[PDB]
Design a protein around this ligand. Structure first.
Ligand SMILES: *[C@@H]1O[C@H](CO[C@@H]2O[C@@H](C)[C@@H](O)[C@@H](O)[C@@H]2O)[C@@H](O[C@@H]2O[C@H](CO)[C@@H](O[C@@H]3O[C@H](CO[C@H]4O[C@H](CO)[C@@H](O)[C@H](O)[C@@H]4O[C@@H]4O[C@H](CO)[C@@H](O[C@@H]5O[C@H](CO)[C@H](O)[C@H](O)[C@H]5O)[C@H](O)[C@H]4NC(C)=O)[C@@H](O)[C@H](O[C@H]4O[C@H](CO)[C@@H](O)[C@H](O)[C@@H]4O[C@@H]4O[C@H](CO)[C@@H](O)[C@H](O)[C@H]4NC(C)=O)[C@@H]3O)[C@H](O)[C@H]2NC(C)=O)[C@H](O)[C@H]1NC(C)=O
Ligand SMILES: *[C@@H]1O[C@H](CO[C@@H]2O[C@@H](C)[C@@H](O)[C@@H](O)[C@@H]2O)[C@@H](O[C@@H]2O[C@H](CO)[C@@H](O[C@@H]3O[C@H](CO[C@H]4O[C@H](CO)[C@@H](O)[C@H](O)[C@@H]4O[C@@H]4O[C@H](CO)[C@@H](O[C@@H]5O[C@H](CO)[C@H](O)[C@H](O)[C@H]5O)[C@H](O)[C@H]4NC(C)=O)[C@@H](O)[C@H](O[C@H]4O[C@H](CO)[C@@H](O)[C@H](O)[C@@H]4O[C@@H]4O[C@H](CO)[C@@H](O)[C@H](O)[C@H]4NC(C)=O)[C@@H]3O)[C@H](O)[C@H]2NC(C)=O)[C@H](O)[C@H]1NC(C)=O
Ligand SMILES: *[C@@H]1O[C@H](CO[C@@H]2O[C@@H](C)[C@@H](O)[C@@H](O)[C@@H]2O)[C@@H](O[C@@H]2O[C@H](CO)[C@@H](O[C@@H]3O[C@H](CO[C@H]4O[C@H](CO)[C@@H](O)[C@H](O)[C@@H]4O[C@@H]4O[C@H](CO)[C@@H](O[C@@H]5O[C@H](CO)[C@H](O)[C@H](O)[C@H]5O)[C@H](O)[C@H]4NC(C)=O)[C@@H](O)[C@H](O[C@H]4O[C@H](CO)[C@@H](O)[C@H](O)[C@@H]4O[C@@H]4O[C@H](CO)[C@@H](O)[C@H](O)[C@H]4NC(C)=O)[C@@H]3O)[C@H](O)[C@H]2NC(C)=O)[C@H](O)[C@H]1NC(C)=O
Ligand SMILES: *[C@@H]1O[C@H](CO)[C@@H](O[C@@H]2O[C@H](CO)[C@@H](O[C@@H]3O[C@H](CO[C@H]4O[C@H](CO)[C@@H](O)[C@H](O)[C@@H]4O)[C@@H](O)[C@H](O)[C@@H]3O)[C@H](O)[C@H]2NC(C)=O)[C@H](O)[C@H]1NC(C)=O
Ligand SMILES: *[C@@H]1O[C@H](CO)[C@@H](O[C@@H]2O[C@H](CO)[C@@H](O[C@@H]3O[C@H](CO[C@H]4O[C@H](CO)[C@@H](O)[C@H](O)[C@@H]4O)[C@@H](O)[C@H](O)[C@@H]3O)[C@H](O)[C@H]2NC(C)=O)[C@H](O)[C@H]1NC(C)=O
Ligand SMILES: *[C@@H]1O[C@H](CO)[C@@H](O[C@@H]2O[C@H](CO)[C@@H](O)[C@H](O)[C@H]2NC(C)=O)[C@H](O)[C@H]1NC(C)=O
Ligand SMILES: *[C@@H]1O[C@H](CO)[C@@H](O[C@@H]2O[C@H](CO)[C@@H](O)[C@H](O)[C@H]2NC(C)=O)[C@H](O)[C@H]1NC(C)=O
Ligand SMILES: *[C@@H]1O[C@H](CO)[C@@H](O[C@@H]2O[C@H](CO)[C@@H](O)[C@H](O)[C@H]2NC(C)=O)[C@H](O)[C@H]1NC(C)=O
Ligand SMILES: *[C@@H]1O[C@H](CO)[C@@H](O)[C@H](O)[C@H]1NC(C)=O
Ligand SMILES: *[C@@H]1O[C@H](CO)[C@@H](O)[C@H](O)[C@H]1NC(C)=O
Ligand SMILES: *[C@@H]1O[C@H](CO)[C@@H](O)[C@H](O)[C@H]1NC(C)=O
Ligand SMILES: *[C@@H]1O[C@H](CO)[C@@H](O)[C@H](O)[C@H]1NC(C)=O
Lengths: 319, 173, 319, 173, 319, 173
């Protein structure tokens, strides 16, 4: 009875194996890895867990103002407002000095609740309609706006007030008319040079209208410029005008929330996915993502790399 | 790897070993064995699991941010919106790149270490009854059947039982 | 006679011990650690080593212009201007287009040194006061501002110059008056439509006044808009006006300081703390802080976490 | 720990050892001892202090920054101000989180190593006069009083003196 | 015959050595290192691989508009436009509301191609010149601008269009005159109160001129304000005016490129350096740089440190 | 270093060793030798090269950025432009500082390891024919000329040939 024995120690290798980046090695083969960058999408937006509002063919601004074909969106609420590329305006031609900011601040509010207040317009005609903004059989205007023309042939100096006696902020959206011809200017407003002042106690803004031709937008050369004034609790809204004023019917409520807006053409689906991208909803099981820098929800960090393998095994040394 | 076991004094891995990450190929009088060590394999798995969970740990959540695409040309404010967005993406991109670089380097050294721990644990368990060949195998200088090999594997090896026999076998002229 | 000996090697453990985050471990116990996040404050602001100026009931803007109750702040100097929430305005009602920028650029200047320059206002009445801005027994105005009304019944076209023949920058603060009524407009300025142009050789700005009612602020519907123009060494300041001009009395000096401003109600104390926060001063021994993102001085970086233990000892393995 | 000493082949620490970080519990013919090793303890303390200083090293110092709180709703410029502030705080939060993770992981391996250094230093000092039991203890195969144990501790152990006695004690049948 | 042998293992040390920062060590000596921070410059800007354009004594804005001495820059193209500090203006005195933005968007365009479009100006005198802007022998004006005065003694309401029937974006640069005196105003434009409106279908802007003195710039008190309007493919440019209109002669082309602008007085050389800095071109073989935060091309990251040694060898332990 | 070789149990380096990074100083009957080991030096050079390359690896490239210098005082927008630029520079400055800190710590440990690898590889090669003196030298207990030392150096050392002579020389009273 005379013999020895051998005991070898070792680890495992794999036939396949995965290249990985290290500190001293550009590429080096390990037993296994996992992708840290999420780089594909389902292609559609899950209706959960966020409250999504599909704007179909309405932009948030058009919905806000009350473009007749956007009447479905009255008092609507969202976490994400999705603006589709096929959106069109079909009311009176308009433009917004800092369009971007209005679109932003309303997005974040995440509500279109409109409270109608009893403004009194002494000695001027109201509810001015237009063929460029049809409402069913006859013609009309934005729903959240009052078009003021003259009475008989007299358009007085408008002096109205509306104090904020509530505990929330008020958002007033009001406008200014810019007529094509001096001929048009006087027919609606009398005074050939109108003027609109809207103010709180903290600040003000006066807009003087500007007569002249713009290009044909819905058969019209005239324009309406849209403006906004926020009124804090205990402040007051004063409106002055000797002409060219597009009256507000009341205010929008404001909320401090997690809500926002996104341009996307992705369909909407019945599923749950916390992280949304314009490309569709994406899973968030990974730390990093390469889909789109624009995101909504608890998302992975956008990164330039399309792939990033994290070693989940030892160095692979094969036979 | 900092310990020079995997891709070091152990020349290659074992594509046969499916049962675990680390283990024993043996050769004795009564034949041949091959079993995977759980305690070292587990250690290497929990740590890699533990570190995977750290990395996958839910990073933060934004909602309303700045716009990141523009149809028009605006200049200064837009310039500033793009530069903010660009430098942000760059710093994350560097974090992501450096993260894996570090993690992977470490994961490698972690596993190399776990292999070395299993070796030095076995070395001590054998005491004077064996010798390091160099290639990650010992020569056990005594009779050591499957039941004997097993006792090493499960940690219950008594070196005294075999010492006189192995010691004596180790010094002959 | 024969025997052996045993020598063991080991490390120490502790009865208590501290949980710590690692790369592989969410929590794991070590011998001892230190906090890397400073998360508490004294509650008060040390008067050192920074030169702190307690605004008390004055905003920097009110102190700048010369609101009578803010007369103590004439020529004042600061590293940090502290603005309290109990601050009021008690002069003529006013607003500032880009209030923020003014408040900022003056903060950074870190001085309210005002140099009185011999401006000549031909054919107009100066030093117009008001009951909304009382000075001791009678009524007054902002101290750094000249209210120009008309002479007899004539308000000529004001055309004045003031070349910067010094080597430092000049800061000019001037205004425009907006009357409540056309009745008020002509009583002060003759021409029913006033105008103010202020210009250097590099740029310019013209403000046309806007008549109308604002809400009662200290019994007044009228307002004053506030504007600023910086004049480089060598350049010239020109001032035009056919009415509604709130003249400057001279300029403020400018410094490129390490000075700034901070809103806070923390008391001020006798002590030395380099890092300041609106919650009070915080020590800077730690690399990270969780008190407030708003800081002044050599401070730890603001971070989202409240705690971050750094291991200062080995893994703890107890008996 | 990468070296498998602390929380490895040394099963637990010593709550008793107040005098230092690493040390020696012994058992000889003349009784019991227990002392702490300075050199290894110092080494571990200096590096941990060395790295503490690096971390506490006074970072940068701002003065006039942007505004970070807003009483009014302003839209776009304010959106940009807030987003810039948030992405900054996030990138610092990551740096802080990853810092301690890296530092802590290291601190552990550093102390583990220092433990292992002491062990191998002692192993080499003893040469052929001792054997590794596996639990971080040696069996000194000769007569070794408190004066003898001391010489090991203070690094002045002469193995020749004891070799013949220990060597002879180690190979008996 | 009794013999042993000794085999020692070791590593190398160097006589000199280099101090290096570590995780546990402020300074510690190693066997060798390399600089990671690039901290010196050649002093000059290599003419490759980027297309560099030396403005000499012309600013991008002066070159754009057509300041006579900047006539060399017609239709020019750059990757980098280098503005020298010795640059002057020598045409009609002017200012640009948001100068900075104009300078930027044109910088990024990277082209000054100008397309002359046959605009029709009915009942007004064209090609108005000035002595403050000499074109060789006689006087003149900006090359890319048409100065409109009145015909006989009449200045009709200008109403013109220029629809973008191309597939690229158009850049129109146009102006508004601000006369010194009402005496001047009427002599050129008849109607003592001019007005300029320029608009697309999406947005608009009216500029009302402001009469008054400015300081003597090239013997003149008058000014011209410069404005810009981009016209998308399909859209229309409309221009209205009852006076004070500085007509555009046509448009500039737009390119989305890698082009930009930089202020520097570094000479330009014949060499190849991918990375440019106002101090001159710098190599990019290092990941970090301390030369200047302002860079162009594939550059190292600007970093606050002047030095950052990366160990390329073991710890140094000498005899 | 974590392995305690360089600046550890090897008290100093060798300013004489020009030919490489690691190596052998010997002393036998027939005289004195000194050579550098290629394989361990290469391992240590390739890794440091491998990591230098990772660090020098072309970082990104911008073109039109924001303006970073201003001749006028503007307030809010300029405030935001400067703060964006400043916080960007700071995050990069921290990345740059932390990079070399990590890298340098590692480079040191890596070379310490490579030294330890060479040592243990030699220890294993010699088997029973030598003993560790404590200072990174073995005593080869047999006769070992220049041709013998060479065999160790190039890896082709046969311990069987010398075992009987060495083993016998090692135990004499
Ligand atoms: C979107 O939301 C808005 C706001 O709602 C708020 O937010 C949502 C999300 C919810 O949370 C909701 O609970 C919140 O309130 C909704 O807006 C409402 O819209 C309805 C109709 O759609 C409006 O009702 C009509 O009002 C006409 C007159 O209005 C006022 O003004 C006159 C003066 O001209 C006053 O004399 C009246 O009293 C009215 O006064 C208003 O009364 C409200 C209720 O008391 C007040 O609102 C309340 O305010 C308190 C605060 O204290 C709380 O906030 C409450 O929650 C809130 O409701 C409001 O402040 C006050 N306003 C003013 C200015 O004083 C009416 O004439 C008209 O009645 C006709 O129609 C009825 C049929 O539906 C019929 O029963 C009547 O008899 C009458 O019929 C008419 O008769 C004449 C006879 O000559 C005929 O000629 C006519 O042809 C005939 N008409 C018809 C149609 O048959 C309506 O009742 C309501 O005022 C308005 N409220 C607000 C706040 O804006 C909106 O509904 C939501 N949109 C959608 C799509 O869901
Ligand atoms: C805050 O700082 C500002 C600015 O000062 C600077 O900053 C500070 C921080 C320090 O660093 C300081 O050193 C810096 O200089 C200070 O502002 C000063 O305020 C004082 C009063 O508080 C002003 O003095 C009054 O001037 C009246 C006349 O005004 C000028 O204009 C008329 C024309 O109408 C001229 O005829 C005069 O000569 C005055 O001209 C000025 O003279 C200054 C002094 O030389 C010049 O300033 C110097 O400028 C140079 C530039 O090269 C440097 O910059 C210097 O450093 C700087 O000092 C200035 O340029 C020049 N301006 C012009 C446009 O030419 C006087 O009438 C009045 O005198 C009365 O009161 C005295 C008693 O206090 C009395 O002794 C006099 O006799 C006189 O008495 C009156 O007499 C009449 C007779 O008819 C009687 O009926 C009256 O009853 C009686 N009145 C009274 C009250 O008794 C003042 O002396 C000073 O002009 C002003 N300087 C500046 C630069 O703005 C301010 O002091 C600081 N505030 C606080 C709270 O500390
Ligand atoms: C910078 O570039 C711009 C733009 O060019 C573009 O970009 C560059 C980068 C290149 O890629 C280029 O290829 C691109 O096109 C250049 O601008 C050009 O400048 C030249 C001269 O320098 C201009 O030519 C003069 O035109 C006068 C008439 O003007 C027009 O309007 C009248 C009506 O009022 C029409 O009847 C005319 O036909 C002209 O109409 C224009 O004709 C162009 C040619 O087809 C059209 O341009 C083309 O458009 C198409 C689009 O389909 C493409 O884009 C093409 O690429 C583009 O070329 C243009 O659209 C069209 N516009 C309109 C509104 O209809 C002429 O009268 C004058 O001729 C005189 O001078 C000649 C000597 O050179 C001489 O041979 C002639 O006989 C004539 O002589 C005059 O005769 C009278 C008689 O009484 C005498 O009294 C005079 O003394 C005598 N004059 C002289 C000087 O002797 C010119 O030919 C050209 O219009 C203009 N093009 C554009 C697009 O703006 C510019 O050259 C570059 N600058 C530099 C420094 O290089
Ligand atoms: C998720 O959605 C993102 C937003 O859409 C994706 O990023 C975008 O990707 C597209 C690429 O399709 C980029 O669009 C442009 O493509 C044109 C090229 O098309 C034309 O030019 C070629 C010339 O070869 C011509 O032959 C063709 O006929 C076309 O006319 C380029 O000219 C543009 O420069 C641009 O690249 C978007 O720019 C890009 N957006 C961003 C922000 O990067 C994203 O990749 C999607 N990801 C996933 C996973 O779905
Ligand atoms: C140092 O100072 C900083 C600035 O003050 C601190 O940060 C701020 O911390 C406060 C905590 O109060 C936050 O203020 C708000 O808190 C109210 C909660 O009160 C209302 O809601 C409860 C619901 O239970 C209701 O019962 C009450 O009646 C109240 O109506 C919230 O409604 C607000 O949304 C808001 O969170 C600030 O938000 C916060 N600042 C920022 C920028 O987030 C900081 O924590 C201080 N740190 C130390 C160490 O002192
Ligand atoms: C000013 O010019 C515009 C454009 O030349 C004129 O508007 C055009 O009017 C016709 C018929 O009336 C329409 O078919 C075109 O579509 C219009 N073009 C544009 C661009 O709007 C307009 O008639 C002129 N206006 C005045 C007041 O003279
Ligand atoms: C325009 O309306 C305002 C607002 O109602 C009027 O100002 C009020 O005037 C009375 C005294 O006459 C004050 O007691 C109120 O406090 C004022 N209201 C506010 C909101 O300030 C003003 O009288 C009107 N002005 C004109 C020119 O018609
Ligand atoms: C308004 O004042 C300015 C400045 O005093 C006058 O412009 C000066 O005119 C003379 C020659 O008439 C020039 O030598 C000066 O250089 C001018 N000064 C500046 C600052 O430009 C101008 O004449 C006055 N204008 C009116 C309409 O009265
Ligand atoms: C370990 O292995 C031995 C030999 O095979 C055997 O006696 C036993 O099953 C194991 N020991 C224990 C405690 O389970
Ligand atoms: C080491 O300990 C021994 C035994 O007590 C003693 O001789 C001596 O004091 C110590 N050595 C030195 C160098 O001090
Ligand atoms: C640093 O670089 C190498 C690598 O460590 C070294 O050989 C040399 O001494 C140093 N300097 C050089 C190559 O200029
Ligand atoms: C190793 O060295 C020995 C002794 O010098 C020599 O015989 C042999 O050539 C070397 N081995 C190899 C494989 O080169």
């Amino acid at each position: 009875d005379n013999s020895t024995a051998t005991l070898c120690l070792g680890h495992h290798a794999v036939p396949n194996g995965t290249l990985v980046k290290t500190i001293t090695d550009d590429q080096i083969e390990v037993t296994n890895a996992t992708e840290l960058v999420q780089s594909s999408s389902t292609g559609k937006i899950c209706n959960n867990p966020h409250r999504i509002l599909d704007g179909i063919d309405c932009t948030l601004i058009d919905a806000l103002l009350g473009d007749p074909h956007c009447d479905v969106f009255q008092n609507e609420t969202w976490d994400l407002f999705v603006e589709r590329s096929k959106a069109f305006s079909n009311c009176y031609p308009y433009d917004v000095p800092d369009y971007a900011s209005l679109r932003s601040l309303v997005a974040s509010s995440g509500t279109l609740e409109f409270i109608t207040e009893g403004f009194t317009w002494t000695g001027v005609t109201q509810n001015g309609g237009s063929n460029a903004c049809k409402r069913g059989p006859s013609s009309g205007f934005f729903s959240r706006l009052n078009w003021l023309t003259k009475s008989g042939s007299t358009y007085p100096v408008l002096n109205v007030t509306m104090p904020n006696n509530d505990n929330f902020d008020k958002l007033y959206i009001w406008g200014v008319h810019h007529p094509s011809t001096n001929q048009e200017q006087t027919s609606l407003y009398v005074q050939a040079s109108g003027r609109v002042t809207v103010s709180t106690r903290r600040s003000q803004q006066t807009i003087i209208p500007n007569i002249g031709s713009r290009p044909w937008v819905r058969g019209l050369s005239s324009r309406i410029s849209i403006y906004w004034t926020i009124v804090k609790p205990g402040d007051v809204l004063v409106i002055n005008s000797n002409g060219n004023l597009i009256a507000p019917r009341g205010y929008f409520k404001m909320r401090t929330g997690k809500s926002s807006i996104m341009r996307s053409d992705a369909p909407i689906d019945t599923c749950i996915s916390e992280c949304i991208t314009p490309n569709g909803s994406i899973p968030n099981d990974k730390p990093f993502q390469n889909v789109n820098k624009i995101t909504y929800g608890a998302c992975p960090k956008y990164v330039k790399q399309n792939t990033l393998k994290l070693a989940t095994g030892m160095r692979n040394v094969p036979e | 790897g900092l310990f020079g076991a995997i891709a070091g004094f152990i020349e290659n891995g074992w594509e046969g070993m499916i049962d675990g990450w680390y283990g024993f190929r043996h050769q004795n009088s009564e034949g041949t064995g091959q079993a995977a060590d759980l305690k070292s394999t587990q250690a290497a798995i929990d740590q890699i699991n533990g570190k995977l969970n750290r990395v996958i740990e839910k990073t933060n959540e934004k909602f309303h941010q700045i716009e990141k695409e523009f149809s028009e040309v605006e200049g200064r404010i837009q310039d500033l919106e793009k530069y903010v967005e660009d430098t942000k993406i760059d710093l994350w991109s560097y974090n992501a790149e450096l993260l894996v670089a570090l993690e992977n380097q470490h994961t490698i050294d972690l596993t190399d270490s776990e292999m070395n721990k299993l070796f030095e644990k076995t070395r001590r368990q054998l005491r004077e009854n064996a010798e390091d060949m160099g290639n990650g195998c010992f020569k056990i200088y005594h009779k050591c059947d499957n039941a004997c090999i097993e006792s090493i594997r499960n940690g219950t090896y008594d070196h005294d039982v075999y010492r006189d026999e192995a010691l004596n076998n180790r010094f002959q002229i």
